[PDB]
Amino acid sequence: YLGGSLSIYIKTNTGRTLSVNLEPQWDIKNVKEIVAPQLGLQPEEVKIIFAGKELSDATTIQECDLGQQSILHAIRSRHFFVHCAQCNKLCKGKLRVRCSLCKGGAFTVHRDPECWDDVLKPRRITGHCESQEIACFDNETGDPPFTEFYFKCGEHVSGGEKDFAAPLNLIKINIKDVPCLACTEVSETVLVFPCESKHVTCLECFEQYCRSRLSERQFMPHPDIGYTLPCPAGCENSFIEEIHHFKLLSREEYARYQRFATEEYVLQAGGVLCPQPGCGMGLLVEPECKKVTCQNGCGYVFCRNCLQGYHLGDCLP
Amino acid sequence: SMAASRRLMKELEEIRKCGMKNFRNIQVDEANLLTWQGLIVPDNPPYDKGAFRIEINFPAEYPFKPPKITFKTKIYHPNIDEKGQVKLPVISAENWKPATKTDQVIQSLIALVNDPQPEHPLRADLAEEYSKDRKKFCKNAEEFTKKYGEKRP
Amino acid sequence: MQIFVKTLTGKTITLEVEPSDTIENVKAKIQDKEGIPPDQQRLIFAGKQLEDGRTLSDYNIQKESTLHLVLRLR
Ligand SMILES: [Zn+2]
Ligand SMILES: [Zn+2]
Ligand SMILES: [Zn+2]
Ligand SMILES: [Zn+2]
Ligand SMILES: [Zn+2]
Ligand SMILES: [Zn+2]
Numbered sequence A: 001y002l003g004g005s006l007s008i009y010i011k012t013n014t015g016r017t018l019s020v021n022l023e024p025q026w027d028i029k030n031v032k033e034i035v036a037p038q039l040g041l042q043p044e045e046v047k048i049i050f051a052g053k054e055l056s057d058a059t060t061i062q063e064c065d066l067g068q069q070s071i072l073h074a075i076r077s078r079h080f081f082v083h084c085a086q087c088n089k090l091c092k093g094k095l096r097v098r099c100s101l102c103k104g105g106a107f108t109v110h111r112d113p114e115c116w117d118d119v120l121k122p123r124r125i126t127g128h129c130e131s132q133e134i135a136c137f138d139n140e141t142g143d144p145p146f147t148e149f150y151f152k153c154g155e156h157v158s159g160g161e162k163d164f165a166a167p168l169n170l171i172k173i174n175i176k177d178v179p180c181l182a183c184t185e186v187s188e189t190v191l192v193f194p195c196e197s198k199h200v201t202c203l204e205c206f207e208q209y210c211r212s213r214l215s216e217r218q219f220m221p222h223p224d225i226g227y228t229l230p231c232p233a234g235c236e237n238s239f240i241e242e243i244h245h246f247k248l249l250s251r252e253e254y255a256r257y258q259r260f261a262t263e264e265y266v267l268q269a270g271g272v273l274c275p276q277p278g279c280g281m282g283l284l285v286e287p288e289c290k291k292v293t294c295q296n297g298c299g300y301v302f303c304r305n306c307l308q309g310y311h312l313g314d315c316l317p
Numbered sequence B: 001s002m003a004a005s006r007r008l009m010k011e012l013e014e015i016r017k018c019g020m021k022n023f024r025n026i027q028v029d030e031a032n033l034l035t036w037q038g039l040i041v042p043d044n045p046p047y048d049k050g051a052f053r054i055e056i057n058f059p060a061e062y063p064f065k066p067p068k069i070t071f072k073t074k075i076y077h078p079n080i081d082e083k084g085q086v087k088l089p090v091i092s093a094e095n096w097k098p099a100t101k102t103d104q105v106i107q108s109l110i111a112l113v114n115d116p117q118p119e120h121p122l123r124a125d126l127a128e129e130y131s132k133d134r135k136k137f138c139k140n141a142e143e144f145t146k147k148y149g150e151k152r153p
Numbered sequence C: 001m002q003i004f005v006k007t008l009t010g011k012t013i014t015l016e017v018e019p020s021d022t023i024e025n026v027k028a029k030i031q032d033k034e035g036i037p038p039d040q041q042r043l044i045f046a047g048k049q050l051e052d053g054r055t056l057s058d059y060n061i062q063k064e065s066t067l068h069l070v071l072r073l074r
Helices: A028-039 A203-212 A243-248 A251-269 B005-017 B102-114 B124-132 B135-147 C023-034
Strands: A006-011 A017-022 A046-050 A070-076 A093-098 A148-153 A171-173 A189-192 A200-202 A220-222 A226-228 A282-284 B023-027 B035-040 B050-057 B068-071 C002-006 C012-016 C041-045 C066-072
Touching (some): A200 A203, A226 A251, A243 A251, A251 C041, B005 B023, B050 B135, B124 B135
Parallel strands (some): A282 C066, C002 C066
Antiparallel strands (some): A006 A017, A220 A226, C002 C012
16 A cells, blocks of 8 residues: 555567556556557557466456566466565565567466466476567477466565566465464464475474574485475475475575585585585595595695595504 | 474473372473473382472473483482483484473373383393392382482372 | 575685576586586585586576585596
8 A cells, every 4th residue: 555556567579668557456458448559559459468368358457466567468469475585584476477488478378277286397388479470389399398487576676577586385374274283373374394194384483493403414315305304293205395495594594504415415425525624625536536636726635534634555543 | 492482381381280190399490491390209119109300401492302301319210311311212302293292201201110111221230120020129119219209298 | 697606615606697597508607717627517506416408497596596516526
C-alpha cells in the first residue's frame, strides 16, 4: 500500500521497448486496448504474454503476481521461496521463463504446472518464441534444447532481463500447522526434510543444527549431492540434494561451509594441503608421486607422510 | 540458544509438575539454565531407597546434541565411571534422536541403574563380578550405597 | 554478472561470467589472468568437482558465489 501504482516495461517482437505504468486493477483487455494505440496495432490483434501463459483479457493486473519494473510482451496474431544475494533473509519468489536457444523470454509454455511437480531438469518443455521472427527451431539441431525456468526475488526492485535467485524447494509454508521437530513450536515458515516420514524443522533450528554440525566438519559426504546434512533424526537417504539451502546462514556461517567442503574434498580425493602458514592450497598430486610442490604458491617441498621439509632419507620420527 | 533454551525450559516445567516418585529434588541453578541438579531414589534392593545426587549439563546446542550426566554421589556400578560419568546408550552420540525428551532419558537411566548391563562396561572389574557372582556383588553394592548417599522419606 | 574464484590461500579473484557458460570457459578465464595450465585446474564448489562439459547454470551458481580452486599437477 506504499504506492499501489505499478510501473512496467514492454518489449515486443520489434526492438522497441515501451515504459508504461498502470493501476493494479485494470483489465488486461483494457491493457490490450492501451498497448494497441501505443504502437498503432488494432485492439483485436494484440495477444499478451507473461511468464508463459496467454494472459486472460479479464484478469486483474494485481492478480498476475507481478513486482516492479517487470516486463510484458504483445503481438498481432488474431507461495515460492528463494534466497537473494541482496536480501539475506529468504523471500517470496516469482517464476519466469527464458528460451534455451536465443536466451530470451516471451514464449508460450505447453504444460503450465501448478506446484509439487516434475521440474528443474534441463529437458522438459518446448515452446514457440517471438524473438527473431519466430526462428527458434530445434528441427535442424536434432539435439533438443528446451524452455527453462528461473526465479526472482519478489521483495524488492528487480532487473528483468537477467536477475535470478537460488530456489529453496525444501521450504514450505506450514499449511497444516505442523510442529517443528526440534522445538515442537509451530512455525508459519518451515523446512521439509526429504525422508519418508517428512520430518520438518523451522528456520531457527535449521540454523542452530547447521552451525553446530559445522565447526567440527560433520557434514555428510555424497559425491553427486555434495557435502550435505543428514536428517535431524538421521533417516536414511535423506540428504539435502540442493545445497543452496545453507544460505539461510549469513556470510561467515555459510562461506566457511564452502571452504571446509573444498578442504575435505581435496583430502579424501588424495590431495594434500600446503603446510606453509596461511596457504592451505590443496594440491591433487598423482598417488605415486611423492614430491610435494606448491603450484603457483609458496613452492615449499614436502613428504606426504611427515609434513616437513623435503628430506631424502625416510622420516622416522 | 532460543528454540534451544526455551525447549529446555519447557521440558523442565513439565518435569516439575510430573513429580514422579523416582526422580525428586530438582535443583536448577538460576544462573545457568544449561546445568541441572537432581536426586534419584531407586526402588530396587541393590540401591534400596538410597538417594543418589546427579548433575545434568546440557550443551549450547541442546536440541541437536546429547546431554552428558555425572554422579556427584559415589556409586558402586559397572556402567558408571569412578569420576561419576555414565555410559547411557540413549544418550551416546551414535544413536540419539533430537525428539527424545529429558524424562524419557532419565527413566532410561533409572532402568539402567536397577538392572546393570555388563555388555559394555566403563568399569570392567565390576562388570565381570556381577556377571559371574551376584550375591557378593550385591553385598558390596548395598554396603557401599548405605555408606554413601543420603536417605529420603 | 560476476563470480569469485578462491584459492585456499585467500587470494580472491573476480571473474565476470554468465550462467550459460561451460566450466571450460571459466577454466579458460581463470588461467588467462594468472597463467595456470588449463588441465591443472580443478574447480570445486561445495565439495564437488565441476565437470568441464557442463555449465554454471546446471549447478545454480548465484551472484558472487565462491568457486574454490584446486590444482591438479597430473
Ligand atoms: Zn532480493
Ligand atoms: Zn527464443
Ligand atoms: Zn524448531
Ligand atoms: Zn527423517
Ligand atoms: Zn603453498
Ligand atoms: Zn617425510
